[PDB]
Write a protein that binds this ligand. Structure first.
Ligand SMILES: C=CCN1CCC[C@H]1CNC(=O)c1cc(S(N)(=O)=O)cc(OC)c1OC
Ligand SMILES: [Zn+2]
Length: 256
């Protein structure tokens, strides 16, 4: 699977029939249809910079992984009763500044999106066990609006020169990715899925109301990553955003 026409979003259902499921992500958040939910608690993130582990070029994207052997780095509150353990963050982006985000808000497409990924360590003993469970996963999504350069992205962007081609991996240490979140943690939540194969319906989504900035040149750094292995012809990683999927009756709740 990929983001090519031959192996892309429109094709994923042939190998992963859940692609046409009732809980697929991402979605268009229509603000006139969201329901304020008084019981939603504030989002609580408490991440230990010593849990940052490595940065890896996975062909379609790059991932920053965290040590997830214990509860040093956790998400709590919002819609959750259980503690969720941080394991990764990554980005999605588009061929153009005009699109790139996965979620949209009242039909508006942002330039990129940050995903901070967690698994339910209260209920399950590993990411692999949690990944297919309705309550297994949690993602904080942040819409990225093209404008001013975002100095908080710097350590990440500086690291990409060491993982230029597919399969390249490097240490990535001493980083707290709560530094990337917006100052307001007002949020939408809905029950959803992984936005790429295997597309499991295992994700409680937390979408921040407030965007963060990114420059057109910072986005160019992401698109300059290469999907090919070292020594082959260069194939820039131009896009990795899935189109929005039908709500199929789900309710998007607002903390605000
Ligand atoms: C089940 C596949 C395991 N993969 C390899 C190791 C991490 C993972 C790669 N990334 C994802 O598949 C992945 C992607 C998202 S996303 N883009 O936010 O829907 C979320 C996630 O866990 C909340 C993910 O991990 C389960
Ligand atoms: Zn993602």
């Amino acid at each position: 699977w990929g983001y090519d026409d031959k192996n892309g979003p429109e094709q994923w259902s042939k190998l992963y029939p859940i692609a046409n499921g009732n809980n697929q992500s991402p979605v268009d958040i229509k603000t006139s249809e969201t329901k304020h939910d008084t019981s939603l608690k504030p989002i609580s993130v408490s991440y230990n910079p010593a849990t940052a582990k490595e940065i890896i070029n996975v062909g379609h994207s790059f991932h920053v992984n965290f040590e997830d052997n214990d509860n040093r780095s956790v998400l709590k509150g919002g819609p959750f009763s259980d503690s969720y353990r941080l394991f990764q963050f990554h980005f999605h982006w588009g061929s153009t500044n005009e699109h790139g985000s996965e979620h949209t808000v009242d039909g508006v497409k942002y330039s990129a999106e940050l995903h901070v990924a967690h698994w339910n360590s209260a209920k399950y003993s590993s990411l692999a066990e949690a990944a297919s469970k309705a309550d297994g996963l949690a993602v904080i999504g942040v819409l990225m609006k093209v404008g001013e350069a975002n100095p908080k992205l710097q350590k990440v962007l500086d690291a990409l020169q060491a993982i230029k081609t597919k399969g390249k991996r490097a240490p990535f240490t001493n980083f707290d990715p709560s530094t990337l979140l917006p100052s307001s943690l007002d949020f939408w939540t809905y029950p959803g899925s992984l936005t790429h194969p295997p597309l499991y319906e295992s994700v409680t989504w937390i979408i921040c109301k407030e965007s963060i900035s990114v420059s057109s040149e910072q986005l160019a750094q992401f698109r300059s990553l290469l999907s090919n292995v070292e020594g082959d012809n260069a194939v820039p990683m131009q896009h990795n955003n899935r189109p929005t999927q039908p709500l199929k009756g789900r309710t998007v709740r607002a903390s605000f």
